[PDB]
Write a protein that binds this ligand. Sequence first.
Ligand SMILES: N#Cc1c(C(F)(F)F)cc(O)n2c1nc1ccccc12
Ligand SMILES: *[C@@H]1O[C@H](CO)[C@@H](O)[C@H](O)[C@H]1NC(C)=O
Ligand SMILES: *[C@@H]1O[C@H](CO)[C@@H](O)[C@H](O)[C@H]1NC(C)=O
Ligand SMILES: [Ca+2]
Lengths: 699, 743
Amino acid sequence: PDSLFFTDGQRRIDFILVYEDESKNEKQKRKRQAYESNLICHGLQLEATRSVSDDKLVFVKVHAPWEVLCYYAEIMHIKLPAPFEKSRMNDFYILDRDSFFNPATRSRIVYFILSRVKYGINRLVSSGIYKAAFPLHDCRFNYESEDISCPSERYLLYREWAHPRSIYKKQPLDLIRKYYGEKIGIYFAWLGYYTQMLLLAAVVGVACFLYGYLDQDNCTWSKEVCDPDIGGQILMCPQCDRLCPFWRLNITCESSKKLCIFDSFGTLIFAVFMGVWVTLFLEFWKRRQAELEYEWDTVELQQEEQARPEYASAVFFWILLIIASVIGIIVYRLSVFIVFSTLTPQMATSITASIISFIIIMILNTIYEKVAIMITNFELPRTQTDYENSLTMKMFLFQFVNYYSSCFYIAFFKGKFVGYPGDPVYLLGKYRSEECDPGGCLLELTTQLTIIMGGKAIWNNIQEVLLPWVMNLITPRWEQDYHLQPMGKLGLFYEYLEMIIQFGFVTLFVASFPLAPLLALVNNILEIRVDAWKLTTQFRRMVPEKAQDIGAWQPIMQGIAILAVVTNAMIIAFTSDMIPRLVYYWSFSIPPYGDHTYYTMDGYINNTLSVFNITDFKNTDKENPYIGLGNYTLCRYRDFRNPPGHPQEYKHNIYYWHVIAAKLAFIIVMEHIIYSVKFFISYAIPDVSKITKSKIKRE
Amino acid sequence: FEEFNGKPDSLFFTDGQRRIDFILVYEDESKKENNKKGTNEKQKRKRQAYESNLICHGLQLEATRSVSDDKLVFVKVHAPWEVLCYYAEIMHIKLPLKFTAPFEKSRMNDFYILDRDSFFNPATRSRIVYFILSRVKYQVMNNVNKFGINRLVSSGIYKAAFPLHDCRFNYESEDISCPSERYLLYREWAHPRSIYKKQPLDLIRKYYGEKIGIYFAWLGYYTQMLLLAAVVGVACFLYGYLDQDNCTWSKEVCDPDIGGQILMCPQCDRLCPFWRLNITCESSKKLCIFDSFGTLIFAVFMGVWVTLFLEFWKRRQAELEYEWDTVELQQEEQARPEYEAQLCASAVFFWILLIIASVIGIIVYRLSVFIVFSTTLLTPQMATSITASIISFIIIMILNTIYEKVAIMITNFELPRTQTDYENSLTMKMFLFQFVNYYSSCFYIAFFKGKFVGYPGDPVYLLGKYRSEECDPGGCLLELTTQLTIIMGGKAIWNNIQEVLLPWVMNLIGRYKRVSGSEKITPRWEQDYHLQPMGKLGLFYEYLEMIIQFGFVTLFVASFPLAPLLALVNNILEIRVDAWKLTTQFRRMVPEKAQDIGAWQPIMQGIAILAVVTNAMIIAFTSDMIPRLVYYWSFSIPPYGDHTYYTMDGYINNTLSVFNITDFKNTDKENPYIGLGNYTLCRYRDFRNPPGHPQEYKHNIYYWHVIAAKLAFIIVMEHIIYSVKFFISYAIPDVSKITKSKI
Ligand SMILES: N#Cc1c(C(F)(F)F)cc(O)n2c1nc1ccccc12
Ligand SMILES: *[C@@H]1O[C@H](CO)[C@@H](O)[C@H](O)[C@H]1NC(C)=O
Ligand SMILES: *[C@@H]1O[C@H](CO)[C@@H](O)[C@H](O)[C@H]1NC(C)=O
Ligand SMILES: [Ca+2]
């Protein structure tokens, strides 16, 4: 009756050893028989059952006798999930002398016993000695189990927390760590509290975004860019080599109006706020980690060493990092090139380039993970924890480069090192440096970032789980569980990697796009339930494991924060064009330099653009693109340089150095202020949380 | 009990087989009691309760009448083996060998035990009996328990309580069996005749405990690292000295054909007339010597050396912790609230007082300079700077004691939970007060002096009659160096003199209170009672002074390469000054244990972190290195300059600005400059457009280029030094290989 115990026997299962009869290399069959005989002889009860669907396949069952299992568990440091000790049976009440131990704990202990066995459960599966070994779920999730004794914990947890109907329901970590293990429990607690604080980040970001959005009318520079009498008269220079004429500047009202949203004081305030939000996230997560460590069964002894089933090139890895970064940059550049070489149209072309870049990123991710795995295996880590740590580092670095190259390029290395029209820059020869429009490449950067984040989260979640669930929205236990498949040894690793990449996206380039926390919040709200459903539905049961913290990812979080402060400062200083506007408003709109009687932004664009003379087309005396293109003689370009007819011909003028001094002063002041606040908040742990230590140490 | 038996240096009981551990001193009833005799009787009853409880707990006692004054009674103490072992077991004290488990009586055969007292060193016995005295209780009234030896001296029932020094420091004990550790320490450790021999930290630990041993080990290691730093700094200073004919700007200012022709512009109102830059040819030489690229190299080397010092101190700390086997007692630590006990307002008051202290320091330095300048009428300028620095240092020394007292009051008004909390609050408050007090003037000179003064036409008067001070063309680097060296050297000298003298003069006054020609033999306890009490704070002030010295060494090291040398000589003297005052003019401090220096280590970390930014800002703003580099790289070229190749020629002439004298606007004081009536334009240290021009006196391209270069240099140095410090910290294993093997 699909019972969780042996036939006509009150003994509960802990693994299924499925073996296919060789009758449909006899030394392999002899080894299998010897291993089974030894397993039986060690004092483990076993039953043999033939698959109902196919008689050829026979399943080998195992159990755990109470006395021997308890003795072998007490042999080493295993405590109660009052303390357990074979000298104190009557001292502490036992709910039942046959089922007191948590089924997860019994599965863990018997797994340890099988691990100690030598002719290798996974080795036997690889060699075909025993095809697989995996425990059984309490009940098939479709409907609650008939058996009264079985609590049907799987169905109960599914309905309570894995079904989307509980979307607003708070996290029930109780059954999670009672059934799956400490790893999944801590992972889900971390995910949930991350979402909790992403809510605060998203509300603050939305406040800043509305601050920017409601000031459209008073965005003077955009208004001037649009007014034909002001914007149109500015006949800009061509920004390419062979396929661009003199173009007016008022063709970019849509771009300027969109940019005035993400490039106002709201963005700066939001970056400042995220500066302290990141440290609050880290510190409060440390505190929740400590609280979980105290509350849950995390006082277990730490194992020293273990064997591995399978058992200087460091610079060689860095070369691969460099190649990957260059490949990403090349991919983005060629994508934009091909899309250009054919209101909405320019934005649609940018979106198409971003989509192609994301497609290439996703295609290359598989190659990156494969190469990382092989190179890590070539080193032959002594144990498995070291192997996981090294894989974490290498995989995270490939991901980091592959996902952030394009972003870093657009933010910093695009339009920042191009010369004046007379003497442009060709670093490698015939490879001109692209130049941003007067507003800058901030809008393109934010479009790229939002497209990448969306595409990743959406496509990944859909293709990995949601197909059965979206179409829905539109035999014995051992056989059924066998029909399922495992998650391997890096499923939790992949979930952590996805979450870390999402965190990096939301924190690093947060100045450009103040709405990133909201998208990450929605993604996490989806992802927690998606992962719950997938784990509890489509994947076999897993042996529980104990972990205190998330693992090797916390250092990545700290590094990402320390990098994000600098990245945000650099973005606001260079990528955006707010510092030039501030400097103009406060210094160059006055009689000493300007002509206005009071600080006003009137005439900013006009008075900021530098003029160029076609007659000085080249210092190299080569072919010019300004040939023909009408009877025009002078064109204005995006740079701070002295006009023709000045003693210094096309050299940086006073305004350039004023603006660069302002940029560096902003970088210094913001960096120092944010780091000081971060250090104060890290030093004020005792002065904020008088509650926690007193509560813990009083009782 | 009886009186003095006749053996003056005997450290045993009258029988001669028992050893003394403390001397309990009180005043007998034979004194002329006043006020209320009921209070006197209560003190008596408390005293008999004390003695009764002590005898009950198993401590043998005997009293003795002071030989000179009958009104003083000395009460000895002795710890038999049973009680000593009991309290050692409950303290988890680890016992010497030559892996390990706590100490139990059952295993005497596994330790090198010969006799009861001989096995236990006097320091541990004194600590054990001190704990016994602190914990024991006598009586309860008002439904509140009462106890504590410190409360006894607080109430005046007991004048003091202290262990006994082994013997006279300058003579061996007449007992052939006495180790006379004090004499050995005096002959080899103290008594600066041994100014060079390595101090025997093992004997210091054995005698004065780990609290003093760790301090002196830290001092010695600090001296060694300062020797390394001073050698490097001397190398850099010597390199700067051997190249003076090559400082082209120094030559230009010195040469009368170039510097003399430049008619500089008055800084003053009617106190100074015009003047020729050539007068400033010596300062220029000195600046060459202390602004050189040697200064930059030394600043980077200091950024590295502060780290190396911190991590090597951590390594030595781990070594000491292993060797001195303090782990068990470190694990078992328990403290009780101050017997005085038996918030945000205070914090804001402390911060306001700290701000006031900073402002007072700035104002006193400015007033000293003002009065010295007004009194005016080997360089006379140098003499004026030295006089102003001397006055400022005097006032700083005066205000130091006031700040100490106010910190004491602020911390006492609050209710510290336990001794450690009070100690840490005092550490923080004292360090902040002395930081502000000592460094306000230096920071003012470095950053806020001569940095926000306008052109001569429109000077910056703060609020009226207060014209902002401004520097010479080279900069105030030399003024800062003079002020810093004067402050540091004067503090070293005065501190050493005061430390050596004040306990000594107090002892001589105490003797003079008995002008009668006694000249006789007194027992050990009586003559040890005449030393100073060594107030319970302990090495707090020693650590404070060394932390101030370290702050001076690191914070401003971009303006004084010789600071490590001064610090080295000061520390070589300080080792022996502290050793002498500790061995010869103080009662035995009760031994204890400490993991580290204390609350000061976070202070040292903070100083190291702030040093990078302070040095970067010094080199960027107070020094004129960056303007020189900018001129050599971007203004000695045809686009702006005239030289075909990069060179420092014409630097001074081209750098300065010009001002039309008749272009002095404003109706107040219409005749500040035209009085002389000799020339019509003046040159001042500033980067501004010359007269005429569309932008007459607004900053020119040179100013903004130099500002951008300064900020870029600040960013680059900060980031590179921080990264190198991070990598140095990561690379260092923090524990030596020998320690790893043994541990
Ligand atoms: N020249 C020179 C100086 C020399 C040396 F002789 F070595 F060159 C040494 C020295 O201590 N100082 C020098 N100039 C100083 C100005 C202020 C304070 C100290 C000063
Ligand atoms: C720009 O202004 C000119 C004024 O002549 C005009 O004709 C054009 O429609 C405006 N808009 C764009 C996008 O060029
Ligand atoms: C000061 O300048 C005068 C005038 O050129 C010159 O004669 C004298 O030698 C100079 N003195 C110094 C010390 O430079
Ligand atoms: Ca001292």
